[PDB]
Write a protein that binds this ligand. Structure first.
Ligand SMILES: [Cl-]
Ligand SMILES: [Cl-]
Ligand SMILES: [Mg+2]
Ligand SMILES: [Mg+2]
Ligand SMILES: [Mg+2]
Ligand SMILES: [Mg+2]
Lengths: 184, 184, 184, 184
């Protein structure tokens, strides 16, 4: 009855971090068009996901094109979504003796003041990994875990000897981009 | 007191799949060296992990070097670990109406015989994403989820209308490299 | 028909290696419809590219959807494209003293029978990198270069001591997935 | 003759961008020690490369451990090196009609004020790809190329129609992390 003459998407560009969402809106012309329904699509779906209502969620580093197409007339408009890297901001989770630093998408596990330090860790429902932590050269130890994604659940404990004799710590649970710590 | 004169690492090369392990052995010479301690290290810890006992675990595609160094004398030997891509052999986890195909590290969700299909999923402790599944053009629908890791836990269901009206399927859970299906 | 009534894409599923191409064709319904022009699109452009004439090139591992949309009527059909990874074969490029093995997308540089080996290399218009090659324990050396992609251009030479004294080899050029060598 | 007793790595932590370098140095205890030779190793070589003289180069985002081991004593110390992502800062390379935006490690090719736009590009010694650029909805066009690394050589031109005839722009060359443009 009142045909669509056009569509625009707002915002026309947005930056999100991996795991963050932005709501897009399709503006259909004329404003009294009978059928304002749109299909949302993305040309780079490993970068960004789009819901049936234009909610865009960053999945990985990159820039992609979200398009809205009118059910009436197949007019199409698009926005550019940039998914930005995790900031390299160091977030510390634990105490003076042990814990981890979040450094973008790597975790740096640390044990301070020992004879040796091992790390026991598991990621989501994969297997346990037992590793020797690297000596810094001063009684301190470090071990980087690489390339975590948003939602990755890491269970981890240490075996170390701070003098008395070898002890195991209680397993902690860390969720990538959900567990909070204190900045730099 | 008997000094270490050499070390060999066996096997000298090995291919594993991601999340598969292989036990290396360090042979310290001579057999009656008084210190037979070795440290295991990996030059490429993104690709494979090594335990203090030489258990090497494939983490991601590529080739790396695991070295054994003697505590006595710093004698060194090394092995080549090749971590092989997930095979592209199509495994079906589902039935004739809906489910997924595992195709290497991507999952292709499918719904057959509907007027529309949506997918509701979540990976690990990430947020639920809602997508419209892409029509093939014959009343069937697909939607790929890209780049899963060994242990990644996908929880999912569908909304579709096979004639009588929209219904939701029950929550299913897939664990990447663990959940089994029908190698079709 | 003057009008278009439907479209199907032929083939409906296809697999290529990264680097390879598959021609898609759109079967426009009415056998002899007026306008048989389609728009080709891809929902996973990291994985596969599609030409205006429906040629699909694999860019990176994964599975994606390529759609043809009719100019007349905006009928849409789609094909599933699987891009398989470089198989972890071993291709030798060199002689019995030095060269590299191509192992899927990593290169294993080797020098056999030396008192030390350095590798000097450069990838595309990137900077020169100098590395000490890891000793395997028997006067041989290896060094893996990780995650090369199709068309990556590597210039390399070695400094090693075969006993007589240090020499430099002549620079060689390798082009990833173009330069060939000795299979198995 | 004066032996070795210890080593520290200077600096003990450092951050670079992908493509960039930081010189590490081993401080060997006794500072008059006759043999100050170290071996440099890195545990995550996908992330960062180390020269036989302790120059570390960032190759890919993440955090890794670079170790110095004394030739005399094989005492060892470690530095933590963070490789930070190419910032998602928009650099415009082109003019008001056509060019590209560098947005982290993705390039967004654009053509403004056309009835259609195609992009012809080639990465390094890979194949030339042809793509229909995606219309924004206003007579402008866009097409992202994804996940370039430092030194990647992109040769491109455009076919577009500014109103009265398709024309081809001349070949341009972009060198990722080398070609400069104007920030935002
Ligand atoms: Cl993609
Ligand atoms: Cl690595
Ligand atoms: Mg895209
Ligand atoms: Mg390595
Ligand atoms: Mg896709
Ligand atoms: Mg590391």
């Amino acid at each position: 009855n009142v045909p669509v003459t056009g569509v625009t998407v707002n915002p026309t560009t947005a930056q999100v971090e991996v795991g963050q969402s932005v709501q897009l809106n399709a503006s259909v012309a004329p404003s009294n068009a009978t059928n304002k329904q749109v299909t949302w699509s993305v040309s780079g779906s490993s970068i960004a996901s789009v819901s049936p209502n234009g909610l865009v969620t960053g999945l990985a580093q990159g820039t992609t094109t979200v398009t809205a197409t009118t059910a009436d007339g197949n007019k199409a408009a698009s926005a550019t979504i940039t998914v930005a890297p995790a900031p390299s901001t160091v977030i510390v989770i634990g105490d003076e003796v042990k814990g981890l630093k979040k450094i973008g998408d790597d975790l740096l596990f640390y044990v301070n003041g020992a004879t040796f330090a091992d790390l026991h860790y598991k990621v989501n429902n994969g297997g346990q990994l037992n590793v020797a932590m690297a000596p810094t050269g001063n009684g301190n130890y470090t071990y980087p875990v690489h390339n975590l994604k948003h939602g990755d659940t890491v269970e981890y404990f240490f075996t170390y000897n701070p003098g008395q004799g070898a002890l195991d710590t209680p397993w902690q649970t860390y969720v990538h981009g959900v567990t909070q710590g204190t900045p730099e």
